[PDB]
């Protein structure tokens, strides 16, 4: 059983790396586009007031 | 589209303003379509009298 837990921890390493990669992609390429969308929405609100 | 509808609403407002007052907001005479109707009405009154 102690032999098997070792392999479990190694597979957990393998999943941790992908978690890091996904977080990095989200930070680098998804957030600024959402910021651009929000910038586009505020002006639409102003036009609706007009 | 919202800016374009902003531009259209002013024309609707003036076209419906023409139903109560002769002058058109900024201070010009109504001169299209409605003016001809008013001229026809005046001519009809004079023809009645004659």
Automatic annotation (TrEMBL), chain B:
Organism of this sequence: Enterobacteria phage N4
Where are the residues of the annotated region Disordered?
9-32
What name is this protein filed under?
Gp54
Q: What is the lineage of its organism?
A: Viruses, Duplodnaviria, Heunggongvirae, Uroviricota, Caudoviricetes
């Amino acid at each position: 059983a102690t032999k098997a837990e070792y392999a479990l921890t190694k597979l957990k390493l393998s999943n941790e790396s992908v978690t890091y990669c996904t977080a990095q992609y989200n930070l680098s390429s998804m957030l600024p586009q959402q910021l651009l969308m929000l910038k586009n929405q505020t002006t639409q609100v102003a036009e609706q007031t007009k | 589209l919202t800016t374009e509808q902003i531009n259209m609403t002013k024309e609707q407002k003036e076209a419906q303003r023409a139903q109560t007052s002769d002058t058109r907001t900024d201070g010009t005479r109504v001169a299209g379509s409605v003016g001809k109707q008013k001229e026809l009405y005046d001519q009809q009154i004079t023809s009645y009298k004659r």
